[PDB]
Amino acid sequence: GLLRQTKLNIIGEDDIVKFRKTAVSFFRTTHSIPDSYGIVVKTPPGNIVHTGDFKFDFTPVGEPANLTKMAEIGKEGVLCLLSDSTNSENPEFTMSERRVGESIHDIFRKV
Amino acid sequence: GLLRQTKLNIIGEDDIVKFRKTAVSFFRTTHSIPDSYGIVVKTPPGNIVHTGDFKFDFTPVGEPANLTKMAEIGKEGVLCLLSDSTNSENPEFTMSERRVGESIHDIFRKV
Incomplete structure (x- = not known):
């Protein structure tokens, strides 16, 4: 029911949302769902980075x-990183969705 | 014997050597020998990149x-890439020298 009374905003790669002393930017990542972003919260004392949930798929x-853009973010300086720990026990490199496809x-040819 | 009569130059990460219409820059890579660089040759029609021999080791x-710096180089624009093909038949991610160490x-504890 709460759809009527909430302010839904849609952003993209290139949007920056600024506040008095704080600004929020975005960078695209890969994950098990489409359209996933990581986040950079700029504050005076330095920049905070949130990886969202991520893998690497080339x-x-x-x-x-x-x-x-991730490389730039690091160059620009980063005070703290919040990084997704979920699969950290596995040494291997994640197989690409291309491979499952x-x-x-x-399977569709053999069955 | 040819040491006397040749001009040996030592460069580092940050050196640029310029010529009339052509300039040469460098970026550090990892390989089975220390102190390895890749190369960017800037020319009017665009930039050429040579990977040297490389792996990735975090x-x-x-x-x-x-x-x-590699990320910047790509952003700046790259006309052509000459990339090391030697291990391209292997899908796996290269074990780190840290792991062999x-x-x-x-071995030194057990023997």
Whole structure:
């Protein structure tokens, strides 16, 4: 029911939302759902970065994670990073969705 | 014998050598020998990039590959890339020298 009375905003890669002493920017990541962003909260004492949930996929189905922009963010300086820990026990590099897609198509030919 | 009559120059991360219509810059990479650089040759029609020989190691023994600078180089625009093909048949991610060091120390305790 609360749809009527809440202010829903849609942002994209390039939007910056500024407040008195604080600003919020975005950078695209890859995850198990489309359209995922990480976040940079700029504050006077320095910049805070939130990875959202992320993997790396160099052959993704969607829009490729913005590595260029992540590198810039680090150069510009970063006070603190909040990074997704969920899969940290696994040493291996995550298989690309491209590979499962291939596996899907293969099943469709054999069955 | 040819040491006497050749001009040996030593460069570092931050050196640029300029010529009439062409300039040469450098970025640090990781490889099986220390002090390895990739190269950016700037020319009017666009920029050419040479990877040297490279792997990625996020826990290297030496100076870490300059990812920030690689990202910048791509942003600045790149006409053509000459990239090291040698290990391109292997899908896996290269084990870090940090891990072999660990394995070396382990041998030294057991033997």
